[PDB]
Amino acid sequence: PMFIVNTNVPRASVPDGFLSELTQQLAQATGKPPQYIAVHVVPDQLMAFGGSSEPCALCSLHSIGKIGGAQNRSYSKLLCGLLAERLRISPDRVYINYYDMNAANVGWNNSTFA
Amino acid sequence: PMFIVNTNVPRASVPDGFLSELTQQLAQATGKPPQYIAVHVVPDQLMAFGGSSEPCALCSLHSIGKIGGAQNRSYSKLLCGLLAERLRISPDRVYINYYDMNAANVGWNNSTFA
Amino acid sequence: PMFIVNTNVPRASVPDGFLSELTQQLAQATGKPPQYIAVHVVPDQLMAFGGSSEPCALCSLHSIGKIGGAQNRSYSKLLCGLLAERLRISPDRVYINYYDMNAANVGWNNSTFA
Numbered sequence: 001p002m003f004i005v006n007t008n009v010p011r012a013s014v015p016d017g018f019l020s021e022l023t024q025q026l027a028q029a030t031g032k033p034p035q036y037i038a039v040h041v042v043p044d045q046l047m048a049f050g051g052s053s054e055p056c057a058l059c060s061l062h063s064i065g066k067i068g069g070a071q072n073r074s075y076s077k078l079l080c081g082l083l084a085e086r087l088r089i090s091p092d093r094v095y096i097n098y099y100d101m102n103a104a105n106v107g108w109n110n111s112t113f114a
Numbered sequence: 115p116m117f118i119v120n121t122n123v124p125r126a127s128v129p130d131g132f133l134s135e136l137t138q139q140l141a142q143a144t145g146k147p148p149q150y151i152a153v154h155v156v157p158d159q160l161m162a163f164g165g166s167s168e169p170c171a172l173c174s175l176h177s178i179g180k181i182g183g184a185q186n187r188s189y190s191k192l193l194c195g196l197l198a199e200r201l202r203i204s205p206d207r208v209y210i211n212y213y214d215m216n217a218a219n220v221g222w223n224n225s226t227f228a
Numbered sequence: 229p230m231f232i233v234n235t236n237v238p239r240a241s242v243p244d245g246f247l248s249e250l251t252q253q254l255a256q257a258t259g260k261p262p263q264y265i266a267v268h269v270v271p272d273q274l275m276a277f278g279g280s281s282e283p284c285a286l287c288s289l290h291s292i293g294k295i296g297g298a299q300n301r302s303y304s305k306l307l308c309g310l311l312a313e314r315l316r317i318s319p320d321r322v323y324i325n326y327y328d329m330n331a332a333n334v335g336w337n338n339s340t341f342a
């Protein structure tokens with residue numbers, strides 16, 4: 001799986017160990033070994049949520065399967081919680097886009113997961 | 115709706131008010147309240163369009179519905195116009211990817227929109 | 229097509245000519261004129277792959293058709309090869325998400341490709 005966070009929160013406000021914490025938390029949540037989990041945090045972004053430049057985040061989670069109604073609700077609770085506690089971003093200023101990827105459409109190690 | 119612009123135009127060339135203008139005009143275009151509109155502008159990018167490093171932009175617009183043939187043509191006219199006027203990027207060096215998101219696949223405020 | 233690379237590799241390790249090489253090699257592989265190819269490289273990213281901060285890349289390739297099992301494998305070999313040779317990223321620390329875009333959902337030059 002792949003989790004990306006774009007945020008206007010500055011680089012110095014991203015705790016050391018945030019990437020490792022996201023990796024571990026997502027491995028637990030997706031039921032996948034941490035070796036397949038990729039995380040990407042992009043601070044200092046020029047963005048607005050509802051016309052406002054208060055702290056916000058635009059995120060995505062891509063996974064081959066393990067994507068759906070209840071799972072996405074549980075991921076949103078998890079990830080907003082982490083963004084609230086660690087980056088001090090209110091949950092109502094976070095979007096997370098979920099993508100269920102087909103294995104043939106994910107390249108890795110010179111081939112795909114097909 | 116979420117609008118993201120990635121561009122090789124420098125940060126100094128993005129005028130004051132640009133994020134607010136994008137939010138307002140997307141609100142006008144989509145009819146949707148400005149409170150749920152998210153905008154993100156990423157200048158100074160290393161990119162090429164047709165092998166040339168003249169000003170260009172790679173964009174995306176995600177919406178839960180309000181995506182389709184006529185609507186996307188209308189959004190393209192609007193957004194290319196704004197990019198041409200404000201960032202001096204030619205419309206023929208802009209790509210905009212449109213995504214019709216399922217409400218179950220958009221996380222917000224510890225849940226999703228389903 | 230449009231090809232985007234996000235990587236923790238520093239800007240100085242991206243060789244001169246890299247965008248042009250990507251454009252030419254993608255034009256070659258897809259059998260398309262280089263005028264249709266857009267490329268975007270984002271170095272210096274805060275990212276991990278499997279909890280490790282060794283060199284890695286998170287990429288996407290968007291195309292209007294010409295996406296599928298065999299073609300995606302061929303693209304992965306090509307693009308992993310380039311990232312390995314030029315950026316010294318191991319192929320098993322690269323993800324490439326492939327997207328088959330509908331022509332109606334790609335904006336360009338004030339309209340869409342529909």
Ligand SMILES: O=C(O)c1cc(-c2c[nH]nc2F)ccc1Oc1ccc2ccccc2c1
Binds near residue numbers: 260290292329331334
């Ligand atoms: O090579 C592509 O598929 C292609 C892809 C993009 C693109 C930009 N963001 N996401 C994308 F997928 C843009 C132009 C392209 O050239 C065209 C454009 C229209 C076409 C219509 C029919 C058949 C082939 C076509 C090829």
